[PDB]
Design a protein around this ligand. Structure first.
Ligand SMILES: Cc1ncc(COP(=O)(O)O)c(CN)c1O
Ligand SMILES: Cc1ncc(COP(=O)(O)O)c(CN)c1O
Lengths: 435, 435
């Protein structure tokens, strides 16, 4: 079966709605995907939906003969890491703790898949609230609800479909829990400090009313520190600091979903580190390859929590051992090459170019925004946004849409300024055509 | 970090409740796990909880230099197969369809994780019932419930926690939907045809009453064809044939969860093939490495079902490409070496040995049973069962418990009769000690 027959073969069994290219696994490299059909190179600002930290075939992995042997040993089999431990797994865990660890969150748990990472954070919270309730004479049947935001995306699994609310297509006709949802007071152009503060006060009022009308029954508040799929919506640290206080006042855990923000993209290991808000639990995935949760802070106050009692959380495999070995090596490159700092510096560069674009196309390039390499702008209409994406595709630049009118950039941490310039040049060429 | 330090390093971050050994990834082979600490060999009747078809480091994979190159190409990166297609992926899909495919179930969907496989089958059913309802003038808000069995295990995710009901530890303190659950009329010793028929009639009565009291709101019936975690409980084909008819009478889909039964273990590609009941959807995982669903039969009667409409089902990765490449090679070995037939023949051998054991230890070795290599027996008490497992561990044989009093065998498809003899000899040595 040949590159030119891939879509035909897949189309017999599945809906084939992905990209027109066929990925060349060998010739792709760095910020470039290679189409196996034509040999055309595509500038990658999409990175498998933000899940690739170093891009394709990074030299540090590709040339490391010792790593090849370690990776191959892992890749031949697929152990259940839940039951059976290995050196390969232990090395991953200790380097994870070293590079991405937070001393307040010592408990680690791994699973395949970002939605399941968020679910296990929820399960930890449900268990914690029920037991905390029980310990203070409150009915342990209470503590089953999740406070969350409008525009959130946390996955497409049984619990996360009750939280995710972006496009109706994602959630329609699937059963849901009736959990409290509050407005998202994200930053927008032409609102100053007082205007933002009033927007936040209204979301906070809603949050407080949820807690007061469902007493002892809200186990946690969950949020993306920056909403990704819903449209790269950013929040002031003030908003989360207030939410932190409100969670503590009502004995509820604060969970950040860093599946999309995490692992260096914003310039630090985790976005929450720049907002100066301490979560009780963090869900991670995508760039970490293996998914999971880190937990601590108030979790520890319930001594028989899910991290302390066997068999409360589990899966057959406990994450994919191949992903752990790959992730271990990727983390070592990040640490060795100072890639978080490189994300800060190139993120400032990309953001500066987007500011310039906005200045040159004031009516068209709206709300340029970002934190580190997580950057975006918006268009007047969704028709303009969709056309811009098509025009970029024609120019061999891959970007992702988000929300109704956003174009998002998800470059690899190793992106160069010349590559950023090439992406910007394409947007510049395309814009007069969409107008 | 050295084998003797693995448990210490992991114990800083996680609850370490798995096996005392450290897996040697290189020296393990076939039906044997090697402890890296001692070099002791362990006879493996556990196979990473039934997820390894060929055992460790199969020669057909290990010696295949061309496959090594293909596997390495996949293992270095982790593409989002949802969006970006490859030759490696297309080869996997066409060999899956060839070796495991059913012509009535042409729609394939892949995801990481067995619980999420079952969830996507449920989502297909919820969507189908709502749309089928809508098409016949019934409120499309109806079709949100799942008929299922007592003793079922379908996973630990948001929807499957509402179905799974084995140990209370798995589900306690987690929110659940109130879905209808019926008695499981499994085969037991000392019930003849009439006695079984009466047991089945009672479960069927309960099923019928669920359908009649929740009109148009039950989207599907889900079952394991043989209940695994709940205790290797087997059902007559008559029971499922009746359920098939009842599902059709109430316009509900029949889904089989073959995550544990699937991929040759019972002697055929899928257990349902031996029961002569046609499902609408099958969830698979474990031995297939990549998880997912096959769907068809009545699914197709709703033209805008989730397999036909973009973005109704999704995940970031669409399954792990490394797992797809590994699984492709494993399927080729199964097909080339006739391993399904080998499972039938060695499964008969293992079952015959268990019958002999029961004859020699009538009061102790209870209810020997199996289909193909999926075999089990029970003990008088859970204390006896737990002690037998400890005694086998001491003799370097790994088996799994199930339910309150079952010991289960999950050998690889490539197990030899000498290896089965060694497992049986160990049980024979251990039994006088537990009595
Ligand atoms: C913030 C966030 N949380 C969770 C998920 C779900 O991750 P996965 O697709 O691996 O289930 C996503 C995926 N885009 C996400 O962006
Ligand atoms: C029948 C069945 N269904 C689903 C699952 C869940 O699979 P996973 O652990 O990969 O989520 C299991 C796991 N033992 C199972 O046995």
């Amino acid at each position: 079966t040949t590159p030119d027959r891939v879509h035909e073969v897949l189309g017999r069994s599945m809906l084939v709605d992905g990209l027109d290219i066929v990925l060349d696994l060998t010739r792709s490299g760095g910020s470039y995907l290679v189409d196996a059909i034509t040999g055309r190179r595509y500038l990658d600002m999409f990175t498998f939906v933000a899940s690739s930290a170093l891009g394709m075939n990074p030299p540090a992995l590709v040339d490391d003969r010792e790593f090849h042997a370690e990776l191959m040993q892992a890749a031949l089999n697929k152990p259940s890491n839940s039951d059976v431990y290995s050196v390969a797994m232990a090395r991953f865990v200790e380097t994870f703790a070293r590079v991405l660890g937070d001393p307040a969150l010592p408990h680690l748990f791994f699973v395949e898949g970002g939605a399941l990472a968020v679910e296990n954070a929820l399960k930890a919270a449900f268990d914690w609230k029920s037991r905390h309730n029980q310990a203070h004479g409150i009915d342990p049947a209470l503590g089953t609800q999740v406070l969350h935001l409008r525009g959130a995306f946390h996955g497409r699994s049984g619990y996360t479909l009750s939280l995710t609310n972006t496009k109706p297509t994602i959630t329609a006709r699937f059963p849901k829990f009736d959990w409290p949802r509050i407005d998202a007071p994200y930053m927008r152009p032409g609102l100053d400090e007082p205007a933002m503060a009033a927007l936040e006060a209204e979301a906070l009022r809603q949050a407080r009313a949820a807690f007061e009308t469902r007493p002892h029954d809200i186990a946690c508040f969950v949020a993306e520190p920056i909403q990704g799929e819903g449209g790269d919506r950013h929040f002031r640290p003030e908003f989360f600091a207030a939410m932190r206080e409100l969670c503590d006042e009502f004995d509820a855990l604060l969970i950040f979903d860093e599946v999309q923000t995490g692992c260096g993209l914003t310039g630090t290991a985790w976005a929450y580190q720049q907002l100066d808000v301490a979560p009780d639990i963090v869900a991670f995935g995508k760039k970490t390859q293996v998914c999971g949760v880190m937990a601590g802070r108030r979790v520890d106050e319930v001594a028989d929590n899910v991290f302390a009692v066997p068999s409360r959380l589990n899966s057959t495999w406990g994450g994919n051992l191949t992903d752990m070995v790959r992730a271990r090596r990727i983390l070592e490159v990040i640490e060795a090459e100072g890639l978080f700092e490189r994300a800060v510096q190139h993120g400032k560069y990309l953001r500066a170019r987007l500011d310039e674009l906005a200045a040159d196309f004031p009516a068209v390039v709206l709300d340029p925004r970002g934190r580190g390499l997580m950057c975006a702008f918006s268009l007047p209409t969704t028709a303009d946004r969709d056309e811009l994406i098509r025009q970029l595709w024609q120019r061999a630049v891959i970007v992702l849409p988000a929300g109704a009118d956003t174009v998002r950039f998800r470059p690899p941490l190793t992106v160069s300024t010349a590559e950023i310039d090439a992406a910007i040049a394409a947007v510049r060429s395309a814009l007069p055509v969409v107008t």
